Design a protein around this ligand. Structure first.
Ligand SMILES: CCC(=O)Nc1cccc(C(=O)c2sc(Nc3ccc(N4CCN(C)CC4)cc3)nc2N)c1
Length: 342
């Protein structure tokens, strides 16, 4: 009949109501988010006199525990002194309310997928993309702090929100999937479009996966379409090979799931399993970005800072981010010194 005295529903989470007032402080406006973890709502803090986004976790043990892990992480980040902290979303405070866990975040604006949908999926200028890229590389540089060593494990355009609708400042949200570096416990991680090959191949992984995701994002921010948009993992790997080529033999010799996509020939060489696709490595990123053809689809022809040189810097950096070897993949600190950011 009723659950938690009629406050929750079938899915253990709070039924939000327009204009409801909590604890004589927070004033609920409207639902803005919904996920497996629970719900996200827009509200007005009366004490700080400001708008905040509150994360209400479901009324279950599991979700509560996960949320507590996440809270510990956020608090851990907020305790560090560097300005690099200001690219991670800020957890002002947290509390319990009617058997629910509530996380108080600063209210942010649109996520990047919204913007992309506003361009009719044509992407944005390279000048803006440079700014986004810079800030993101800074954030990943912060998360790599020895005492932190945090892997976001779920970087996608909808997890990057604007601070202000009229400024190019962004921030990273939802650290529920988050992970501090350590021994492997999970193997089905990251979003499918942004899942690093070492994960697709069932191999050990570190922070280098985030970088991979970032590489898939920036290009998508300029073209409007996902770089690799496979319906499944096979299609995904095929689409990654289609652009970057078949992985190094020394990589595939280590990969347990290597034979999910490949087969080993009698001469030791690896080849794709047939299931559609271009020959490996003939979908050149050079042609995808339209370096010498006036940008993606020729819609950036004649625009400021859209010369061949700029596109070549960009392409070099992106190819440094999509390195197959996690050991040789470009690191944030060196990424911030690229000619792209001059
Ligand atoms: C949309 C939220 C999301 O994808 N992940 C997420 C989950 C839980 C909390 C947060 C988070 O930190 C947020 S979410 C937020 N405000 C916000 C939430 C939702 C939205 N929209 C969601 C997408 N709609 C098409 C437009 C409005 C816009 C802004 N501020 C913070 N600080 C983000």
């Amino acid at each position: 009949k009723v659950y938690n005295d009629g406050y929750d529903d079938d899915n253990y989470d709070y039924i939000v109501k327009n204009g409801e007032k909590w604890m004589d402080r927070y004033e609920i406006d409207s639902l803005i988010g919904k996920g497996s973890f629970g719900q996200v709502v827009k509200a007005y803090d009366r004490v700080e006199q400001e708008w905040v986004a509150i994360k209400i976790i479901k009324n279950k043990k599991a979700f509560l525990n996960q949320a507590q892990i996440e809270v510990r992480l956020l608090e851990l980040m907020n305790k560090h002194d560097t300005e690099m902290k200001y690219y991670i979303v800020h957890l002002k405070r947290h509390f319990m309310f009617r058997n629910h866990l509530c996380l108080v975040f600063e209210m942010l604006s649109y996520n990047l997928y919204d913007l992309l949908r506003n361009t009719n999926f044509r992407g944005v200028s390279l000048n803006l993309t440079r700014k986004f890229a810079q800030q993101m590389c800074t954030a990943l540089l912060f998360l790599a702090t020895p005492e932190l060593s945090i892997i976001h494990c779920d970087l996608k355009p909808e997890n990057i929100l604007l601070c202000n609708p009229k400024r190019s400042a962004i921030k990273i949200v939802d650290f529920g999937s988050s992970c501090q570096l350590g021994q492997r416990i999970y193997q089905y991680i990251q979003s499918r479009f942004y899942r690093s090959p070492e994960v697709l191949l069932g191999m050990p992984y570190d922070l280098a996966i985030d970088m991979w995701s970032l590489g898939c994002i920036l290009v998508e921010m300029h073209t409007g379409e996902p770089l690799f948009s496979g319906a499944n993992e096979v299609d995904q790997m095929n689409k990654i090979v289609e652009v970057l080529g078949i992985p190094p033999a020394h990589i595939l010799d280590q990969a347990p799931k290597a034979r999910k996509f490949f087969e080993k020939l009698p001469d030791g060489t690896w080849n794709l399993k047939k299931t559609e696709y271009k020959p490996p490595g003939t979908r050149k990123l050079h042609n995808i970005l339209g370096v010498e053809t006036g940008g993606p689809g020729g819609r950036r022809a004649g625009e400021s800072g859209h010369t061949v040189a700029d596109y070549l810097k960009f392409k070099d950096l992106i190819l440094r981010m999509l390195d197959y070897d996690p050991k040789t993949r470009i690191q944030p600190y060196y990424a911030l010194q690229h000619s792209f950011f001059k």
